[PDB]
């Protein structure tokens, strides 16, 4: 999540990620790509990365209740 | 009955000119 502050933070990275969206979508929009992202947390992400066509779905994974612990164990 | 003779001399000229298309092609292609 971006900032308006000084001597701290990153203004880079997001160039790679808006270049990811930039080269991928819009510029000859072809449905020849599937974007799969698995973040541990969501609250650090920008709101401009998740809107409607950047990542369409928000698929949460809850805790293995009892039997997925015994199962995966 | 002479159009086949003129087109025939043009066909031997087509074999010579195709031999020079493979000389302009092949012989130049050597160098």
């Amino acid at each position: 999540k971006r900032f308006d502050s000084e001597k701290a933070g990153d203004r880079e990275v997001q160039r790679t990620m808006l270049e990811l969206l930039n080269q991928l979508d819009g510029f000859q929009p072809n449905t020849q790509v599937k974007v799969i992202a698995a973040t541990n947390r969501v609250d650090i992400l920008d709101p401009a990365l998740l809107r409607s066509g950047r990542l369409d779905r928000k698929i949460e994974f809850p805790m293995p209740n009892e039997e997925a612990r015994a199962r995966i164990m | 009955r002479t159009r086949l003779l003129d087109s025939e001399i043009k066909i031997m000229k087509s074999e010579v000119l195709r031999v020079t298309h493979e000389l302009q092609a092949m012989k130049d292609k050597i160098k």
Partner: protein, 73 residues
């Protein structure tokens, strides 16, 4: 931005190299493809279903999407 073969003397663009292999990316392509059937995913089977309806079927049948005629995810 290409690797090309150029004469040392005439400086003519002679041939294109078949060696543009791109470091790290072409190494980022997982070529082994380890196996994981869906018997391992225990507890997220609805997420398997919305996962397949979201992702797997746009790879197979866009006619499932565009005989209805909207968009893929």
């Amino acid at each position: 931005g290409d690797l090309v073969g150029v004469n040392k003397d005439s400086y003519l663009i002679l041939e294109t190299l078949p060696t543009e292999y791109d470091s790290r990316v072409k190494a980022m392509e997982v070529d082994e493809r380890p196996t994981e059937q869906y018997s391992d995913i225990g507890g997220l089977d609805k997420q398997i279903q919305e996962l397949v309806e979201a992702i797997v079927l746009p790879m197979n049948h866009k006619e499932k999407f565009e005989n209805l005629g909207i968009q893929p995810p």
